[PDB]
C-alpha cells in the first residue's frame, strides 16, 4: 500500500500510523532522541502489559494504565509512571488509536531511536481496556529472584525470557530508587542498546552512588551508575546467571531475543490473528559502532563470575 503522503506499508490499515509516528518523534521524543522519554515509554509498555494474571484478571497490554490511571498509578510499583502517562494521554485523545496500541507503538518507535536497537514487531487494533489491572502484579527491585520469576512465569515468561526482557535496562535510569541522584543509569551507556548492562551488573559492588539505605538498591560498581538489588541477584542466581552472562558481547542474541520477547509482551491479553501487522512502520534503528568492554581499569578479577559451565569472556 501507498499512504496518502506517499510512504508505503504492507497493509493499508497501517497508514493511519504515519502521522502518529511523526507527532511522537517530534512531540513525545523531543526530535527522535534516545533519551528519558523513550526510556519511560519503554518502561510503560511493561507496567501496562504485566497487569495480566490468569487467576486474578487484567487485560495485559490494553492501555489500562492510561484508561484507569487513577487506580493503577496508586500502586507503589507504578511510582513515577504518572509523568509518562500524563504525557502520552493527549496523543491518544488526539489520534484515532486505542491506548493499548499507542503505548506499544510509542515503545517500539522509541527503541528504534537507540543505536543497537531493534524494530519490535507491532500489531494494530487492540480494543479499549475494559478493566483496571489487579493490584500487586508488577515486580519490584526488592523482590526475591523466586518472587520475580514466579510473577513473570504466571504472565507467561520463562526465566530466560525475563533475562532477555531485562536488556531494557541497557537504556534506563532511576529517579525514585535514590531520589537524591535522579537520572542515574543502570549501565554506562543509557542511550545505547548494548550488552553493557549485562557486563556491569556482574562486577563486584563497590559503593552507593547517592545514599546508602535505599530499599531495592544494591552497591554499584561505579560512581555514575545505580544497581537494583533484583538485577544484582538475577545476574548471580543459578536460575538465571548463565543466561545473563550469555548476553555479554552477544548483541545478535540481545537483538533477536528482545524483539521476539517484547512482541510476546506487547501481545499479552491480545490475539495477533485479530490484529493487523504494522511492523514495517517502525523506523530502522542505528547500529552499534563500539565494542563491548569492561569499564576502563577493571579486569576479570572485578567480575563475580556466576556461571559454573562457562567462564565469563575476555573483553
Ligand atoms: C523483572 C523485573 C523488573 C524490575 C524489578 C524492574 C525495576 C525497575 C526500577 C526500580 C526502575 C527504576 C524506576 C525509577 O526509580 O525511576 C526501572 C526502570 C526501567 N525499567 Fe525495569 N524492572 C523490571 C523489568 C523491566 C522490563 C521487563 C522492562 C521492559 C520494558 C523494563 C523497562 C525499564 C526501563 C526502560 C526503565 C528506565 C525508565 C527511565 O529511564 O525513565 N523493566 N525498572
Ligand atoms: Ca494493562
Ligand atoms: Ca546501554
UniProtKB/Swiss-Prot annotation:
It catalyses: 1-(4-hydroxy-3-methoxyphenyl)-2-(2-methoxyphenoxy)propane-1,3-diol + H2O2 = guaiacol + vanillin + glycolaldehyde + H2O; 2 Mn(2+) + H2O2 + 2 H(+) = 2 Mn(3+) + 2 H2O. One of its GO terms (cellular component) is extracellular region. One of its GO terms (molecular function) is manganese peroxidase activity. The keyword Heme applies. PROSITE patterns: PEROXIDASE_1, PEROXIDASE_2, PEROXIDASE_4. The record marks 43 as: Transition state stabilizer. PANTHER family: CATALASE-PEROXIDASE, THYLAKOID LUMENAL 29 KDA PROTEIN, CHLOROPLASTIC-RELATED. This is Versatile peroxidase VPL2. It comes from Pleurotus eryngii. The lineage of its organism: Eukaryota, Fungi, Dikarya, Basidiomycota, Agaricomycotina. The gene is vpl2.
